[PDB]
Amino acid sequence: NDVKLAPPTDVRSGYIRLVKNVNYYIDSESIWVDNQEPQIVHFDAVVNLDKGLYVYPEPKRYARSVRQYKILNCANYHLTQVRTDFYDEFWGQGLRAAPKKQKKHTLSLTPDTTLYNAAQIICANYGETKKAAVSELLQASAPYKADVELCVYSTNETTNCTGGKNGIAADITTAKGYVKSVTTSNGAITVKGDGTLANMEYILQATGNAATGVTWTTTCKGTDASLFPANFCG
């Protein structure tokens, strides 16, 4: 038949308008992310209709809303529509029409696209640190500093306080996390960052001995040395 609907004027809790169409909502409560793929955001869009769609076995029953299951890749702004469901109540609830085949399709959300700003917002909230990374870079030298001090008290010199000698652990030459490498030579521990910290490096140098006192200097290098914590760099 032909039924005219009056879509709800007030926004239901958990739904939000982010596009020109006031009857098209993002269902905030539906949003989920798998932490193993942290830039891939799963969500439903919901449209409240202004005319019923007769898509049920019973010829008098009609849909009042549509729920579209979407996947947004925040790394490349690709948006995939996965499934479309028709519901007999507003807000994508109630009895669901029989499933139809979705021509699964993906598109790139460039700045002219209707959903571009909605995607920016979804990504800001769900699609994904630096201080914790820098802390790990600092912690990398800790075991080596301890090893070098032990060496200096035992041997009475900084010469030969080198990785793989005098109880000093071997140099780390395999990148792991934010640490590219840790090397120790003659009382100098050189730490280089990796990835986001690739432009950060520091050198901890031991000088002296028991009688003079064992002193440490910290020298920082790299274009991003400004990211080191207050008072760290000498």
Author numbering: 8 to 135, 145 to 250
Sentences from the paper on this structure:
The construct produced in this study was a fusion protein composed of a large part of the PE sequence, a hinge of two glycines, and a large part of the PilA sequence. The crystal structure of the PE-PilA fusion protein showed that most of the protein was visible, except for three small disordered regions comprising the first seven N-terminal residues (in the PE domain), the linker region (residues 136 to 143), and the C-terminal His tag. PE-PilA also crystallized in space group C2 and had two molecules in the asymmetric unit with a noncrystallographic symmetry dimer interface (area, ∼450 Å2) via the PE domain of the fusion protein C terminus. Interestingly, crystal packing analysis revealed a crystallographic 2-fold PE domain dimer, very similar to the one observed in the isolated PE crystal form, with a comparable dimerization interface area (∼870 Å2). It is unclear whether this crystallographic dimer represents the biological dimer, but it probably represents a favored interface in the crystallization process. In addition, two disulfide bridges in the PilA domain of the fusion protein that corroborate the mass spectrometry data were revealed; one (Cys167-Cys177) links the N-terminal α-helix to the intervening loop of the first β-strand, and the other (Cys236-Cys249) links the final β-strand to the C-terminal loop. Only the N-terminal hydrophobic α-helix tail was missing in our tethered PilA, but this tail provides both an anchor for the globular head and a hydrophobic surface for the assembly of pilin subunits to form a pilus and as such seems less accessible to antibodies than the globular head and, thus, less immunologically relevant. We observed a more substantial crystallographic symmetry dimer interface (∼870 Å2) in PE-PilA via the PE domain and one of ∼890 Å2 for the isolated PE (excluding the C-terminal His tag). Interestingly, our PE dimers were generated at pH 4 to 4.5, close to the side chain pKa of the key interacting residues Asp52 and Glu54, while the published structure was obtained at pH 6.0.
In the present study, a vaccine antigen based on the fusion of two known NTHi adhesive proteins, protein E (PE) and a pilin subunit (PilA), was developed. PE is a ubiquitous NTHi antigen described to be important for the adhesion of the bacterium to epithelial cells. It is also known to bind vitronectin, which protects the bacterium from complement attack, and immunization with a fragment of PE was shown to afford protection in a mouse model of pulmonary clearance. PilA is another ubiquitous NTHi antigen described to be a conserved protein among H. influenzae isolates. It is the major subunit of type IV pili (Tfp), which are hair-like filaments involved in adherence through ICAM-1 (25).
